[PDB]
Amino acid sequence: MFYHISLEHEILLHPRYFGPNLLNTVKQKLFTEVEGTCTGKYGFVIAVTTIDNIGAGVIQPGRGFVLYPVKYKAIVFRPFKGEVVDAVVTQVNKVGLFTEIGPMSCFISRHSIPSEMEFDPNSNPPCYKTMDEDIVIQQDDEIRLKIVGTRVDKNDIFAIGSLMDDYLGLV
Amino acid sequence: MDDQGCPRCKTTKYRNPSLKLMVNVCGHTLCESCVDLLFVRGAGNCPECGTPLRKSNFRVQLFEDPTVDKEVEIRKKV
Amino acid sequence: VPAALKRLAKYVIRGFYGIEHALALDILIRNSCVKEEDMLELLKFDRKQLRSVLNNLKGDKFIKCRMRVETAADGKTTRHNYYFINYRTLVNVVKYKLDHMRRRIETDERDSTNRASFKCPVCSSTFTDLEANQLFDPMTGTFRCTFCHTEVEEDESAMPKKDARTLLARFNEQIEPIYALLRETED
Amino acid sequence: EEDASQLIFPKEFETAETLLNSEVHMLLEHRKQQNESAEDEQELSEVFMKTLNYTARFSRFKNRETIASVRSLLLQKKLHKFELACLANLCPETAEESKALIPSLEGRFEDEELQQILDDIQTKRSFQ
Ligand SMILES: [Zn+2]
Ligand SMILES: [Zn+2]
Ligand SMILES: [Zn+2]
């Protein structure tokens, strides 16, 4: 589920930016620094909705940089294990299905693809289809998957999806 | 008490009588220790029969006869 | 002393210990209490030979020892060590020793469940399927080892699981005679 | 440590508010207008684009009044914000589906009450 939360971040403003428009520069730098970044604790941050407060800028001894602790309201998304989430399949391969859920990308391993499914490599767009052809899962389709687990690496989060349970798969 | 043991792992029968058999569409007896083994790897197929299964596909059913186990589930479904 | 206790003690001693332990236990079985000096002269064992065996019996606490002090006919002090079998601790320790195998056997099954599947053939390092995706290189499209910059293998992880499982299973099958003797001796 | 099926979440996500994809889309659209206005400033990240595309496709409500009506009506019910967010976002067609998707939902409301709530949401939903 998407979450709107207040986040704590410290802006080390370079002295050249002091004087007029300092706080505006802090706001601009905050967006620039936090937006487009991800953290294992809070996940991906989409946008800063507003800033709760700009703390008193502590001048760093020797560094000259001023450390501004900032509280800002932002929207984030984190995948939770043991939960069902709607997803869009991005790439289909014999190894598994790659899917996108907002900022997060989830992978469904072949072992987690239902027994009724089977990969159809001869098809021009790779897809998995059932023996009776009742449902077909391909790229850019509406599917629901179970978050088996969440992993984080290099400021990126990727989860494992499963379609074995009921009400899953193509919807 | 009466079951001599599961073909996969029978220690549970001698260990304690509180554990219950897990039924599958495979019509093949399996038990709780096997459940953990299939969750980590090869969740898609039976350990020996090779028949495909959707992850664990394990349900509690205490009959000793797997045919009755399967037929009772068939009974309800039918 | 019910015969069921003697049979259990003889079965476990001859089953998981050497004949030295069995022979010493049979002496403590034939006679409720025997002096260390008597057992030494009878078994013809050396002091350290018998003492180490007795220390093992002391380790599993299957036997108890009491020390008696008296003055000999010539006036010299004498300290005799009287050993006897403690069926209560023996049955309790074997019950732990056997239920600890079950814990260890199921721990070995859990190990066979947790033993990482992927591995590097160069450095002979095993990688967990969770770490394998961390180690995945999109440029190559396959698993590789960061230290060796070489392909990572996955199929060889079935061999140790299969082999160990046979030992674990065969252990449970052979241990049943002692379990039956225990059920017969719980009282 | 955290499990949605068990309704276990860290304190960091306890005082946090859950937003629907329709509501998140509204926020992103606001951020879009804010970024599109006052031209020549920093361009939006691909993370914004990816999230906007995803949340727009799954947006269950395209009208502010429907979101306010659903939010105000659901708040009346004795349901947790997580349960209401899942309910108003997933929008299951039947009570049985709602119980299947959310195992913690059982016992909160009766089948008729649960189905009636879902039916109301289906009526409140805007179909294209
Ligand atoms: Zn078994
Ligand atoms: Zn089978
Ligand atoms: Zn290596």
Swiss-Prot record, chain B:
Lineage, uppermost ranks: Eukaryota, Metazoa, Chordata, Craniata, Vertebrata
Modified positions (Phosphothreonine) are 51
- Name the record gives this protein: CDK-activating kinase assembly factor MAT1
Cell location: Nucleus
Quote the range of the complete protein represented. 1 to 78 of 309
RING-type zinc-finger residues = 6-50
Q: What does this protein do?
A: Stabilizes the cyclin H-CDK7 complex to form a functional CDK-activating kinase (CAK) enzymatic complex. CAK activates the cyclin-associated kinases CDK1, CDK2, CDK4 and CDK6 by threonine phosphorylation. CAK complexed to the core-TFIIH basal transcription factor activates RNA polymerase II by serine phosphorylation of the repetitive C-terminal domain (CTD) of its large subunit (POLR2A), allowing its escape from the promoter and elongation of the transcripts. Involved in cell cycle control and in RNA transcription by RNA polymerase II.
On tissue specificity, the annotation reads: Highest levels in colon and testis. Moderate levels are present thymus, prostate, ovary, and small intestine. The lowest levels are found in spleen and leukocytes.
Q: List every position bearing N-acetylmethionine.
A: 1
Q: Tell me, how does this one assemble?
A: Associates primarily with CDK7 and cyclin H to form the CAK complex. CAK can further associate with the core-TFIIH to form the TFIIH basal transcription factor.
Q: Which domain of life is it from?
A: Eukaryota
Swiss-Prot record, chain C:
Compartments in which it is found: Nucleus
Which residues take part in binding Zn(2+)? 120, 123, 145, 148
Where exactly are the zinc fingers annotated as C4-type?
120-148
What residue stretches are annotated with the HTH TFE/IIEalpha-type domain?
A: 5-95
- Taxonomic superkingdom: Eukaryota
List-wise, which residues carry N6-acetyllysine?
Answer: 58
Q: How does it assemble?
A: Tetramer of two alpha and two beta chains. Interacts with TAF6/TAFII80. Interacts with ATF7IP. Interacts with SND1. Part of TBP-based Pol II pre-initiation complex (PIC), in which Pol II core assembles with general transcription factors and other specific initiation factors including GTF2E1, GTF2E2, GTF2F1, GTF2F2, TCEA1, ERCC2, ERCC3, GTF2H2, GTF2H3, GTF2H4, GTF2H5, GTF2A1, GTF2A2, GTF2B and TBP; this large multi-subunit PIC complex mediates DNA unwinding and targets Pol II core to the transcription start site where the first phosphodiester bond forms.
Q: Which family does it belong to?
A: Belongs to the TFIIE alpha subunit family.
| Functional summary from the UniProt entry | Recruits TFIIH to the initiation complex and stimulates the RNA polymerase II C-terminal domain kinase and DNA-dependent ATPase activities of TFIIH. Both TFIIH and TFIIE are required for promoter clearance by RNA polymerase.
**Protein known as:** General transcription factor IIE subunit 1
Task: Name its species.
Answer: Homo sapiens (Human)
What fragment of the full-length protein is this? 10 to 196 of 439
